[PDB]
């Protein structure tokens, strides 16, 4: 009938574990569970829905005494494997799971020692939510916690003590995409309640920027620096509508891109996507320039007339501050006169188209000053 | 033990099938409180509101009582909830699943039976959606809980206090709550011939936009103002449809995405998806003036002729109104240079006609350049009035 | 002991209930099994997985008889809540599920009389299967059905009856997406094999269209109206074949808008995927037609050569038709000559030129009474 | 209370044993009759390889404990146990892709006095099956059901079938497949005297119907409008508009197609393969195009033509083409000379730019039949 | 009948929490095998593997005993897994869901005592990721198995044979496995004592460069290739910026398509990333090259001067590298006057023909640049 039959025969029978009374053998008997939190595997962490998967081994320890017996009557065995479903528990469980599950499964087996002391440690895979930070989004550090509470019972009753300051990470497969800095753990018990004992560890991750600093700002900054190549085209080619759509275009695909990756933002929007909108609000305004810029390039005598201001602000002043510069013989006269008065204003009226096309021309040099030094001041702030 | 014996003697002989009331025709009290720990989510496409929620129920007992100087000095005791009686309350307007909660969260027992159960839920329910102003709106969504079978003169359902407890309360990031009364009434329903009471907890969250305005409504403004750009290019220029194109596309995607991000009913207008239906006609208008623009630039003498009505019109009147004012050997060699004369005379005859329809052209792009400023100021100030 | 308690006792426990053996007292004979189903909330109609939820109360109501006291021995309590499960019960469910599914919702109480008469109230909200009809898809109109069967017994051991031919809508919440027009209930029975009876509850409900009307039948109209423009551009503007295209592609856009809510069909498509079809097919015709008239515009006689039958069929026939009307001496003397004859050279060759300009206009506008007719001649046969 | 006296001695007084085997020798096999019954085909998805029906599964064997004398309690004949209360056989899947390895509902056992045993259960199975996508339009699969015990072998169990064929009376006709056969085997492999079952192998033909008209036609005209950039004039300024939309929207085309379909390393669909095909086409007229225009561009202030190209693209190649080839008077003499001489060298660069502006509207010409060509000669072993 | 009889005396008496040896300081031999059926997704984003497998435990008992000389010689048995000891083995490794596996299955017994239980599980496992050679890769999972409460004391595993048993597989259409060798390790662990055993089956597998090879290479070589195109086009077309920004939209949807479609580690820099990095930047700087040539060609005498330096090296210089070489008075006065125009009109036409000889110059320079550097880099770079 080998020793462990009997051990555990007057361990579990007619004396009657009852299975459900806390151990105590006072009224006032507080039970101090030890706990110690080892992390195994840093699964994921996902900023669209805030919500992190670990594998952790928590340990509990704490100390009953109706199990005990003499390692001499019962052979010389003093340590026991007892299920954890007819062994009292404290029910401790995580109070911050994302989907809203505060239950547990209970299939490990206990280790129950001579002296009483029992030493459990569940397997666990957990889902925690915490708050996800993406100021910098590429370079970011983040801080989710874990929180650990009693279930069932509450204080006056157990004794939720840390066993170590930290949490030893000696089982750990390096993850690819984070970096661990430090894991504490703290105790808090608020003294305007005398019914709230707790104890949490926090998370300090910080990420490795390799995959997001190549797929992702470099084209950005390729794209944005194509912005400034419109106000140097010629308007004869006829292609400076074309060039500044499709530039708003590319850009609108990383914004997609970029907004699709953090969760959606209350008020600390990422510093990558505020410099996007900047450089759209700058396209629009060179899009708006540049439709004035083809207006002022097609003009005829025939149609429009140069103002005499025009002609002294638009020509002789600005253009030194941006620095450029640029008996049949009667019949036969009168006919060959009218041929020659036909070819001086023709030569006139060409003279003043040319004239219109370098006002033009001056006009979208001065632009191309202002995009440069707005667009610096802006990238300085931000 | 004294905590076994008492335990023992308790439930020696009980039955959970049986009401606690201990005279006959009497109803059992209830006290009913619900407290909110994290709204995870408001679905908008379906019309779904998940919560968490922590129901409390205190209700009274008479065999469930001892006296604790035959003890040593216990009042309170915990006892499975699998064995005890306890009222079923459930949350009438569900959506999915199950309608009873999830109790397993062990009872308490007083030495004057003061049943205490305070078990966790998790409840998706159904509330109609209110979508006349997208953004910048109220919503205002119940839940209802009351018991199945035990009818007003059993089970008297009531209320403690008159406010959700929202005390460990995670803060949300999307929406605020503003307002999360409860109220009790009393229903006859046609099917039963009793009165039923209920009790209702309303929540009156209110969006938080950021998501929503820098990324739907400000891009929107943009390509709204960028339709009447078309009437200021030259018509020469040779990139008049590539700019109305583009914004219809932009405008045809943006009305793609709002109606994929928005419920479909169908009992009031939202004043956004009216905006965008408004501005997408008046730009598929625009193209169609562009059209008959550019059509009369490249009119010709040989191929058109110019009415009088159009010259009466379009280039004498229309223009003032617009602050556009119009603005042997011998014998032979006579004979050639006369050609050449009569010929360039002609050519110069063709291009004041040619000149004459570019300047008709620009004028009605210019009135309608016009008339599309001033409809378009007035239309932000009346779809997008009061958002 | 409380009367409830002594009553319950005395009931279940002398007897020795057993829940498994039918109340009926002849081998064979038949148990009425009442039904009456309320209607409480339409939830939500799926058209790509066909499949409907609702919030629906069943009312099943036997007459059990061993189930019986007296109303002055145990107090006088006549009326006596009991657990679900600890009664015989005809396991009725839907035989429609979308999934597997073949079970009931939660148990609650059961309400006894002291006649026997059993009343079963659960509540259950069901995700059945319905065919879903997208021909007239703004304004169609869905028959969607709700079948209940026994589960363990059959005819000749239960007979499933209607209790009123109506599902009565108590404790309705209205919808703002579907209306509700009819709910008739009807009970089938097998005339061949007398083991086959069911209860169906038809749902009749019919769309309330605003929101479609309004992003999807206007707007595509809207783009549709787009196909003629491409005939009226003047053909020397260079950007003949950034329309056409263009409205290709916004059609296509369109189109896979309609593509999603349309389940994936084989007997049935909307009268709008019809239209856009038609108006994509008539895009590229429009697309083959500009790239020929752009290919005739631009021609000279150093490169062709105008045959006779163009010149007399489409410059003064077909015009008519649409209404389209139109010795220092001696060398001096030489050079003079020269120069003008090249001048009358050049002015007979741009005259030529400009022949094969009328043409194109004459053909683009001849295609545009065929586009025209054509589309409204197929817009009258769809409809 | 004769029929609750009737079950009680059946399943207590005679120790019905939920865990023995009801063989009254050493080697007696449990004769097990299967028959299953169609109810609805769902899905065959592609993508992942897998089908989805809902089936009721006949089985029906024999027990000398389950007897009872008729005439002698009441003159009962049939009971509802229910179905965990006596031995089974444990018939289930062997190919499943979800781990779902039992039935769906146990429902009720009906045992009559002769001893004999009806289960129709009803269950929902996910069975793996190869798909052939090499003529996806119309394409005809074959997928099979094994079913095995996963408790007792062949020196217990004798699964036979009843009839060669699967039972089809309830079955709600398919929307977009169609039933051809659907065949019974039993295998037994005389090498491992252990090892029966059955195999219900499904054959389903697909219908043309929603992917012949809204797949094909579209795939077709956008070929044959890759064809018209050779017919645009050089002049217009819309030549590569055309090329590039047209090779997008192939591109697309093909994207969809790999969507809806997943092209593996064992067979390429004949739609996969024809795309390739015109995609490779398209970039060759995008290529030769580009040459065109280069070409059509060239004064004879920056360009030369060599002897060569005249005698080869100006009365060589056209004719196969089927093209055709359509005091003071001193000084007044001296300028009017200068006016002519001007006139006279203006003529002759014209006509050299004419020269080249006919070269390349004959190269071309000649691409067209090339193009035209060679997508005949491929289209017979890429569509045929 | 004897069956009866023996079961009953055999489970009358059985402490299913007690170690089966009959001596408390003796290891218990507990033998594993492992035999797979599929291999169901190979999650590359998530990094996770799925597979279903056939666990193998067979150990000895010592008190579940009988001689088959009495029973009338029944040598085996069958009892439900519930009501006897079985060891707990777990996977260590374990991405989502629960650790334990099954227990429906019946174990088989002998008249010797031998118990050869072989239940069904279906395991999701984690698995890092190389995706250095992404179209053409090989990758290496594995899993861990092992006792998570008995030691190397109590419970010694020990390993049949060294290989999975493959007789019953159904190929993978896009994985083809390699190896799938396994091994015995003892490791001792930080947070407790003693020596505990595991045992590890590791996966090699290889992909199948079909479909990768298929709808992503070739199209981007197409736009690689489509690139160079850019500096043949003359800029009096008019359509060089529609080609090369068209070309930079598809790289750009191509970046976002592999960025959505491979794991983000930050290890090692995946070839395909690499190569279409290096070849956006190309497009890139070619497009600012275009704008500079156009600018170039619309140059004229009125606006712009040529400098000495520009003569001196163009057309001069660099195109031979790239080998690519009374009334009388009055009568006269009017005359000349027209004469002196074209003259005039001449020498402006001349210096503008000067200015767009330039354009094809470095146009020509930066044609064999490009493919110099593009053949030489996606040769070398792509290995
Ligand atoms: C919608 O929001 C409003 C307020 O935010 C709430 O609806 C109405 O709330 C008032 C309370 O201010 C209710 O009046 C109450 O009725 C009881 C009935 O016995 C009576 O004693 C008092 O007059 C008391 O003020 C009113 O019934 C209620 N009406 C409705 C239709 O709800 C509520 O929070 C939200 N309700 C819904 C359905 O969303
Ligand atoms: C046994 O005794 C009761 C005592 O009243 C008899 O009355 C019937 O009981 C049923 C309950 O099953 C009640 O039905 C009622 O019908 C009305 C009219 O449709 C409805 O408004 C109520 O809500 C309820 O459903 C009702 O008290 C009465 N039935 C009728 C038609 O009057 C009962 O008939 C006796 N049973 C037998 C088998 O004799
Ligand atoms: C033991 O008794 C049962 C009945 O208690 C008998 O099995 C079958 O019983 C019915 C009685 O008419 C018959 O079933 C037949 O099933 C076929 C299935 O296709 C159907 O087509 C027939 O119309 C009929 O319903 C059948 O006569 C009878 N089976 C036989 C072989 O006679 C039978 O006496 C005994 N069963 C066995 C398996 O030995
Ligand atoms: C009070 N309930 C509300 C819905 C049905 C009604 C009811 C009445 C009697 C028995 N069960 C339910």
Same mark, same amino acid.
């Given at each position: 009938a080998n020793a462990e039959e009997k051990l555990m025969d007057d361990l579990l029978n007619k004396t009657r574990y009852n299975n459900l009374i806390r151990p105590a053998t006072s009224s006032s008997q507080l039970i101090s569970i030890k706990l110690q939190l080892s992390l195994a595997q840093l699964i994921s962490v996902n900023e669209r829905e805030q919500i992190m998967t670990t594998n952790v081994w928590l340990k509990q320890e704490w100390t009953d005494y109706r199990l005990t017996w003499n390692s001499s009557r019962y052979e010389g065995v003093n340590i026991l494997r007892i299920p954890a479903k007819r062994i009292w528990l404290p029910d401790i469980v995580l109070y911050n799971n994302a989907d809203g599950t505060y239950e547990v499964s209970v299939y490990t087996n206990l280790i129950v020692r001579s002296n009483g002391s029992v030493l459990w440690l569940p397997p666990a895979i957990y889902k925690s939510a915490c708050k996800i930070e993406v100021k910098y989004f590429?370079?970011? $550090? $983040?801080?989710?916690?874990?929180?650990?509470? #009693?279930?069932?019972?509450?204080?006056?009753? +157990?004794?939720?003590?840390?066993?170590?300051?930290?949490?030893?990470?000696?089982?750990?497969?390096?993850?690819?995409?984070?970096?661990?800095?430090?894991? &504490?753990?703290?105790?808090?018990?608020?003294? $305007?309640?005398? #019914?709230?004992?707790?104890?949490?560890?926090?998370?300090? +991750?910080?990420?490795?920027?390799?995959?997001?600093?190549?797929?992702?700002?470099? &084209?950005?900054?390729?794209?944005?620096?194509?912005?400034?190549?419109?106000?140097?085209?010629?308007?004869?080619?006829?292609?400076?509508?074309?060039?500044?759509? #499709?530039?708003?275009?590319?850009?609108?695909?990383?914004?997609?891109?970029?907004?699709?990756?953090?969760?959606?933002?209350?008020?600390?929007? &990422?510093?990558?996507?505020?410099?996007?909108?900047?450089t759209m609000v700058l396209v629009t305004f060179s899009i708006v320039t540049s439709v004035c810029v083809l207006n002022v390039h097609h003009r005829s005598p025939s149609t429009h007339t140069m103002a005499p201001w025009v002609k002294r602000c638009f020509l002789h002043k600005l253009p030194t501050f941006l620095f450029m510069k640029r008996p049949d013989l009667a019949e036969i006269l009168e006919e060959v006169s009218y041929i020659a008065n036909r070819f001086r204003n023709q030569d006139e009226d060409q003279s003043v188209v040319e004239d219109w096309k370098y006002v033009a021309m001056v006009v979208d040099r001065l632009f191309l000053w202002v995009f440069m030094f707005v667009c610096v001041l802006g990238t300085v702030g931000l | 033990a004294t905590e076994e014996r008492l335990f023992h003697k308790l439930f020696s002989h009980y039955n959970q099938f049986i009401r606690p009331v201990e005279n006959v025709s009497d109803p059992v009290t209830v006290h009913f409180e619900v407290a909110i720990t994290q709204l995870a989510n408001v679905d908008e496409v379906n019309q779904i509101m998940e919560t968490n929620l922590w129901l409390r129920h205190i209700w009274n007992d008479?065999?469930? @009582?001892?006296?604790? /100087?035959?003890?040593?000095?216990?009042?309170?005791?915990?006892?499975?909830?699998?064995?005890?009686?306890?009222?079923?309350?459930?949350? %009438?307007?569900?959506?999915?699943?199950?309608?009873?909660?999830?109790?397993?969260?062990?009872?308490?027992?007083?030495?004057?039976? /003061?049943?205490?159960?305070?078990?966790?839920?998790?409840?998706?329910?159904?509330?109609?959606?209110?979508?006349?102003?997208?953004?910048?709106?109220?919503?205002?969504?119940?839940?209802?809980?009351?018991?199945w079978t035990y009818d007003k003169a059993e089970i008297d359902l009531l209320i403690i206090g008159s406010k959700v407890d929202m005390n460990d309360f995670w803060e949300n990031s999307e929406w605020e709550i503003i307002d999360? *009364?409860?109220?009790?009434?009393?229903?006859? %329903?046609?099917?039963?011939?009793?009165?039923?009471?209920?009790?209702?907890? *309303?929540?009156?969250?209110?969006?938080?936009?950021?998501?929503?305005?820098?990324?739907?409504?400000?891009?929107?403004?943009?390509?709204?103002?960028?339709?009447?750009?078309?009437? %200021?290019?030259p018509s020469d220029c040779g990139e008049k449809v590539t700019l109305c194109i583009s914004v219809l596309l932009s405008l045809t995607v943006f009305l793609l995405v709002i109606t994929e991000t928005?419920? *479909?009913? *169908?009992?009031?207008?939202?004043? !956004?998806?009216?905006?965008?239906?408004?501005? /997408?006609?008046?730009?598929?208008?625009?193209? !169609?003036?562009?059209?008959?623009?550019?059509?009369?630039?490249?009119?010709?003498?040989?191929?058109?002729? /110019?009415? @009088?009505?159009?010259?009466?019109?379009?280039?004498?009147?229309?223009?003032?109104?617009?602050?556009?004012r119009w603005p042997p050997e011998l014998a032979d060699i006579l004979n050639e240079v006369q050609y050449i004369?009569?010929?360039?005379?002609?050519?110069?005859?063709?291009?004041?006609?040619?000149?004459?329809?570019?300047?008709?052209?620009?004028?009605?792009?210019?009135?309608?350049?016009?008339?599309?400023?001033?409809?378009?100021?007035?239309?932000?100030?009346?779809?997008?009035?009061?958002?």
């Open positions: 590429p370079f970011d $550090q $983040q801080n989710c916690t874990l929180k650990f509470r #009693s279930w069932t019972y509450d204080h006056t009753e +157990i004794d939720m003590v840390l066993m170590t300051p930290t949490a030893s990470m000696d089982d750990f497969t390096p993850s690819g995409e984070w970096d661990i800095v430090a894991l &504490p753990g703290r105790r808090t018990v608020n003294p $305007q309640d005398p #019914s709230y004992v707790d104890v949490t560890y926090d998370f300090i +991750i910080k990420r490795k920027p390799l995959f997001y600093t190549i797929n992702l700002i470099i &084209p950005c900054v390729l794209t944005t620096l194509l912005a400034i190549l419109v106000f140097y085209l010629p308007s004869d080619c006829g292609e400076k509508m074309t060039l500044c759509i #499709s530039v708003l275009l590319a850009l609108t695909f990383f914004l997609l891109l970029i907004s699709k990756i953090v969760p959606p933002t209350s008020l600390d929007v &990422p510093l990558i996507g505020k410099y996007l909108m900047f | 008479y065999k469930l @009582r001892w006296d604790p /100087m035959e003890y040593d000095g216990i009042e309170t005791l915990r006892v499975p909830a699998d064995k005890i009686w306890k009222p079923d309350i459930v949350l %009438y307007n569900n959506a999915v699943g199950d309608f009873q909660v999830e109790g397993k969260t062990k009872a308490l027992l007083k030495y004057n039976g /003061m049943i205490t159960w305070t078990p966790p839920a998790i409840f998706k329910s159904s509330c109609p959606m209110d979508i006349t102003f997208f953004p910048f709106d109220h919503q205002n969504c119940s839940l209802k809980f009351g018991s999360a *009364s409860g109220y009790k009434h009393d229903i006859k %329903y046609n099917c039963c011939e009793e009165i039923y009471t209920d009790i209702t907890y *309303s929540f009156y969250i209110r969006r938080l936009p950021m998501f929503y305005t820098i990324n739907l409504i400000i891009p929107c403004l943009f390509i709204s103002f960028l339709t009447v750009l078309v009437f %200021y290019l928005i419920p *479909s009913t *169908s009992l009031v207008v939202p004043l !956004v998806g009216e905006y965008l239906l408004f501005t /997408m006609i008046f730009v598929t208008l625009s193209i !169609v003036v562009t059209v008959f623009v550019l059509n009369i630039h490249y009119r010709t003498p040989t191929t058109h002729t /110019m009415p @009088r009505w159009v010259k009466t019109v379009f280039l004498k009147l229309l223009p003032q109104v617009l602050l556009m004369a009569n010929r360039f005379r002609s050519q110069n005859e063709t291009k004041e006609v040619e000149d004459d329809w570019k300047y008709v052209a620009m004028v009605v792009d210019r009135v309608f350049l016009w008339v599309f400023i001033i409809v378009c100021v007035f239309g932000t100030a009346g779809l997008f009035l009061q958002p």
